[PDB]
């Protein structure tokens, strides 16, 4: 893991990418149904992706479970925000479920989460985020988000090296590399915030009682 070159790290991450999944082809119980069904199916692919994030299968099963429980909604969200980059004003949940901001209103308390997601998407667009940078960010999220609840920090340093390598290769000055690195990592703070808000929204939906999968339920539960 820590022996790979930056290019090999990027290659590995690109190769590990999960597929884009489809929705079914609205009320509050209907849209939440589509969204949660999609999320549950994506979750299964995410767990495969995780095992191919360099250093992750090196961890104990307990630690793997913990990171995924902490990270999963953050990872779904950065995925969605990436998919939606070239669709200003819309969220590309699936190629056949492209939702504008106003459709957020069908579901109580969602338009705000929609707004935060759109803002992130808009932010990435302005930064001209690259795919190779995106997969680095997604790996950082997996490994960082549960890490406070040494090998992991070495792997995190490697991914930072990889990000800097991409910016160097793109022709950015030293000063521009550090600034862009900073800009990208600060967005992860916003993504953590969105995940927190999304987690509470999902919990309250469970309470009103759309059905949730067992898997989705225990992911939810771990956040107590």
């Amino acid at each position: 893991a820590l022996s790979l070159t930056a290019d090999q790290m990027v290659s590995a991450l690109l190769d590990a990418e999960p597929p884009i999944l489809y929705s079914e082809y609205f009320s509050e119980a209907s849209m939440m149904g589509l969204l949660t069904n999609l999320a549950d199916r994506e979750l299964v692919h995410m767990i495969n992706w995780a095992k191919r994030v360099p250093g992750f299968v090196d961890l104990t099963l307990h630690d793997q479970v913990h990171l995924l429980e902490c990270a999963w909604l953050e990872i779904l969200m950065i995925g969605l925000v990436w998919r939606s980059m070239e669709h200003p004003g819309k969220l590309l949940f699936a190629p056949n479920l492209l939702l504008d901001r106003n459709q957020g209103k069908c579901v109580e308390g969602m338009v705000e989460i929609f707004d935060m997601l759109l803002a992130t998407s808009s932010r990435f667009r302005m930064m001209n985020l690259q795919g190779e940078e995106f997969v680095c960010l997604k790996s950082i999220i997996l490994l960082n988000s549960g890490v406070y609840t040494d090998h992991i920090h070495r792997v995190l340093d490697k991914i930072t090296d990889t990000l800097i390598h991409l910016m160097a290769k793109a022709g950015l000055t030293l000063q521009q590399q550090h600034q862009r690195l900073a800009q990208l990592l600060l967005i992860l703070s916003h993504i953590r915030h969105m995940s927190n808000k999304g987690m509470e929204h999902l919990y309250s939906m469970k309470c009103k009682n759309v059905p949730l999968s067992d898997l989705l339920l225990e992911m939810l539960d771990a956040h107590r």
Partner: peptide, 9 residues
């Protein structure tokens, strides 16, 4: 939990 199993199979 379930998750515990995906990770193994």
């Amino acid at each position: 939990k379930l998750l515990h199993r995906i990770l193994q199979d």
